[PDB]
Amino acid sequence: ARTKQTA
Amino acid sequence: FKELDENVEYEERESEFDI
Amino acid sequence: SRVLLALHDRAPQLKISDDRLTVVGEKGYSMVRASHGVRKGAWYFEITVDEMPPDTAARLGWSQPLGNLQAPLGYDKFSYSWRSKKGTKFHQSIGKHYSSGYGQGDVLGFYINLPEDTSSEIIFYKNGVNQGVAYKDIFEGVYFPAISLYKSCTVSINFGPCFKYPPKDLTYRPMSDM
């Protein structure tokens, strides 16, 4: 699924 | 919508994955 | 053999790292001893407080083999401890004024002196500062480095031979000598 991420 | 002051663990239900 | 946190001489609820030099607490006070003990001479080791959130605490110091593992260090007659909260010293569950408190990021030093014939001495260090003689003329017996934690705090032990704040006012041998 599409998620905001740190890297 | 409920605010949270801290993260909480989701308590999945038995049919969480069912279609 | 290398000096580590004991493999089996320890409360089972304590979480010990795989290099056996870091330990995490779990609920009420519980203890782990080191794998080697000292019975004559002057010896030294260090402990770093890696993480200590509010409402967690440590009691650190020396224990005989009969120190209760399901209790804080200093609980019985077999151990002497130094509490992160308020710098209290504990022995037989009696807390006496000793130093100011320590916490996360502090590197604590632990000196024991068990002199032969021809007085024994327990001294604590806070980031290299001699905190004074905490206990004098202690029970004769073998003493192990010991760690007791209250809740989920994290500490790391260093037996030597290279310390962050090696004492210069006292002669000693690193616990790593065993």
Partner: protein, 158 residues
């Protein structure tokens, strides 16, 4: 080693409300804004929500997508996602930008991971807060356009 991150975190938790307010975004929908000047390398706010497993997140996204309900998920680690769609904190509203003034970072405490939004520069009162979402790059029929409005905008969020 935690360094000063424990102190910074706890201090941020007692005053994040003074750092932010919610308002209409120039980028899209609602966003978070600096209620006051914020210095470089300041912990601003934590991304808060319900921690769910990967396959839970896959099921929920399709349900959320079924209801035109936007992206409020932030991956915490390889096995867990923070879902803030129905419950969480105002950090869910921080928009994406090609010229970001914040960064998102995981801090590893013993009690668990925390997603912290920090300043990368000085931020002036009334500026909209924004970080790089770092969404997984994808195909054209998927591809999502960017309206961060900055000069030298990349034009896509992928």
């Amino acid at each position: 080693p935690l360094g000063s991150k424990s102190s910074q975190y706890r201090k941020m938790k007692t005053e994040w409300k003074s750092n932010v307010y919610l308002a209409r975004s120039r980028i899209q929908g609602l966003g978070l804004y600096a209620a006051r000047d914020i210095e470089k390398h300041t912990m601003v706010i934590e991304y808060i929500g319900t921690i769910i497993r990967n396959e839970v997140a896959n099921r929920k996204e399709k349900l959320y997508e079924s209801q035109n309900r936007g992206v409020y998920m932030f991956r915490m680690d390889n096995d867990h996602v923070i879902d803030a769609t129905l419950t969480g904190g105002p950090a869910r509203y921080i928009n994406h930008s090609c010229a970001p003034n914040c960064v998102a970072e995981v801090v590893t405490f013993e009690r668990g991971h925390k997603i912290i939004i920090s300043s990368s520069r000085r931020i002036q009162k009334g500026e909209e807060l924004c970080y790089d979402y770092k969404f997984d790059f994808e195909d054209d029929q998927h591809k999502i356009p960017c309206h961060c409005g900055a000069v030298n905008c990349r034009k896509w969020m992928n």
